[PDB]
Structure 1
């Protein structure tokens, strides 16, 4: 009798938007979520775990709003989330040793 595993575990999944909603994208700069993701990860992978970085990406997305004058999407919002079956901190430890 060794320790066994659930069928699925040790996953983290980041979604650009919430159930039943749309994710926003700028036609020049790209998606809000990816842009935010790149900024946080590149800046903080060195000292923050991925789940926490994703909370940080949540904060950026909550404060953003659409620029789409004359259209129904002007000032529109989006909210990101993540779901996690991780069982330890996930530090990416960039550039070490």
Structure 2
């Protein structure tokens, strides 16, 4: 009656292997923004595994805006790995 040493996890990464993230002194990192956005907005009808797919979509389209530098008009790409075995819905609230 046992299970694998590791399982039922799901990790989201702000950037791919080798690349860097994007922090902004006033808005923060894109990953966190995208995260807070998609989660608050869709946690109600979208499962963590699919919301991260959303965050991916957002992060993929975003371009860097910081003129005069070399960070201007740059890209970034998020990723996530999963060993989850069933949809993971956060069922926010659920009225008493």
Q: TM-score range by the shorter chain?
A: over 0.9
State the distance in 1 between where 2:24 and 2:4 align.
Answer: 40
* Deviation per residue, 1:8-33 (Å, 9 max, x gap): 10000000000111011121011100
Displacement of 1:67 after TM fit? Answer: 1.2
Q: 2:91 aligns with which of 83, 90, 93?
A: 93
TM-score (normalised: structure 2): 0.95
* Deviation per residue, 1:21-74 (Å, 9 max, x gap): 101112101110000000100010111100000000000000111112111111
State the distance in 2 between where 1:41 and 1:73 align.
Answer: 27
Q: Which moved more, 1:66-75 or 1:15-24?
A: 66-75
TM-score (normalised: structure 1): 0.94
Gaps of 5+ in 1: none
Give the secondary-structure state (helix, strand or coil) at the position aligned to 1:67: coil
Gaps of 5+ in 2: none
Number of residue pairs matched by the alignment = 95
State the distance in 2 between where 1:63 and 1:84 align.
Answer: 23
After the TM superposition, list the runs of 4 or more consecutive aligned residues in structure 1 that deviate by more than 6 angstroms.
none
